């Protein structure tokens, strides 16, 4: 009913893609694993309007048979054996302030 509360927002939301893209890219970089990950699917994403835009992602991540982009980024493939693919779920919280051309990663905790 409410002003300023988190809203659904569709999966193909260009603004979201960019939000996710950033999140993931940031990750692989924070990760120490020599294999880059990447999203299997977007479970539940919500966008809240504030002093800028805030996104809340629920996605399933997986390990691919690829290097840290030193490649492209660009779609490899996930590891064939589910134990190297170490599938899991993460929740990202991105915060963009466009009129300041900046963007952050407020929270990124995985299962």
């Amino acid at each position: 009913r409410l002003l300023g509360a988190p809203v659904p927002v569709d999966e193909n939301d260009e603004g979201l893609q960019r939000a996710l893209q950033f999140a993931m890219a940031e990750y692989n970089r924070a990760s120490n694993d020599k294999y880059s990950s990447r999203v299997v699917r977007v479970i539940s994403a919500k966008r809240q309007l504030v002093s800028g835009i805030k996104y809340i992602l629920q996605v399933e991540i997986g390990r691919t048979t690829c290097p840290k982009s030193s490649g492209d980024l660009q779609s490899c493939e996930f590891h064939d054996e589910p134990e190297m693919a170490k599938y899991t779920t993460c929740t990202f919280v991105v915060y963009s302030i466009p009129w300041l051309n900046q963007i952050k990663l407020l929270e990124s905790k995985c299962q």
Binding site: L2, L3, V50, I53, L100
Partner: protein, 241 residues
């Protein structure tokens, strides 16, 4: 909870006015713009801004109230997860005034338990009234700044200057303040004759870097019945005297 027709009567009476332009920013009716930051508390900034404006206009006093207190203590709303303007005012009445933001600082999303007895004296309202979607200009002119809802889009969050008329949002989602209406002559580059472009003046809560020093202009007609982005489908204004 009051009746517009009865209220506007005592504040307007005869005093006819010019629908072209009037800006409270030039009549001691608008307090400094603030920033909600990472937290969805526009509903509070909008509300409180309206009451600070009422004090500067009716009491001649310049105070800045605490939207934190309102965010923490308004059990009608949902703090940083949204809220409604009229719920805000509602609770102000129950709480019996809000503290100056000098004693109850804003901290946005940071965990914070509510505490009322945190200042020497509180500032509140007597009640609030709702404004008809065809009386905004009148309302603004004799009653003062109005707390309104509006549907915002990306084209909005990217506003820089001038009288905006870009794409609106999907549904009402943001809370702002209506601090007046203006009018600019602009020579049509094709007919080469100047045309009159009317607009509303809105005070946002995203800081001073956004838009024209925190404000934004919205396209409208001379009567102000044209409410772009449904701006004003929700219009409230607090009364303190």
């Amino acid at each position: 909870q009051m009746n517009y027709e009865e209220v506007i009567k005592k504040y307007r009476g005869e005093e006819n006015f010019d629908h072209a332009a009037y800006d409270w920013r030039l009549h001691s009716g608008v307090t400094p713009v603030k920033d909600q930051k990472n937290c969805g508390s526009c509903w509070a900034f909008s509300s409180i801004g309206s009451v600070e404006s009422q004090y500067a206009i009716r009491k001649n006093k310049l105070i800045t109230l605490s939207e934190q207190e309102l965010v923490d203590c308004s059990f009608k709303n949902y703090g940083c997860n949204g809220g409604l303007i009229n719920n805000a005012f509602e609770d102000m009445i129950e709480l019996g005034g809000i503290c100056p933001d000098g004693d109850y600082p804003y901290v946005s999303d940071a965990p914070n338990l509510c505490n009322i007895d945190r200042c020497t004296e509180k500032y509140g309202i007597k009640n609030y009234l709702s404004v008809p979607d065809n009386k905004l200009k009148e309302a603004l002119r004799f009653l003062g700044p109005i707390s309104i809802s509006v549907a915002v889009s990306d084209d909005f969050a990217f506003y820089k200057e001038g009288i905006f008329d870009g794409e609106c949002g999907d549904q009402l989602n943001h809370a702002v303040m209506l601090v007046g209406f203006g009018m600019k002559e602009i020579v049509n580059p094709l007919t080469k004759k100047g045309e009159k472009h009317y607009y509303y003046i809105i005070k946002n809560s995203w800081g001073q870097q956004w838009g024209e020093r925190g404000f934004i202009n919205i396209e409208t007609d001379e009567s102000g019945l044209m409410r772009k982005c449904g701006l004003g489908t929700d219009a409230f204004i607090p009364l303190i005297e």
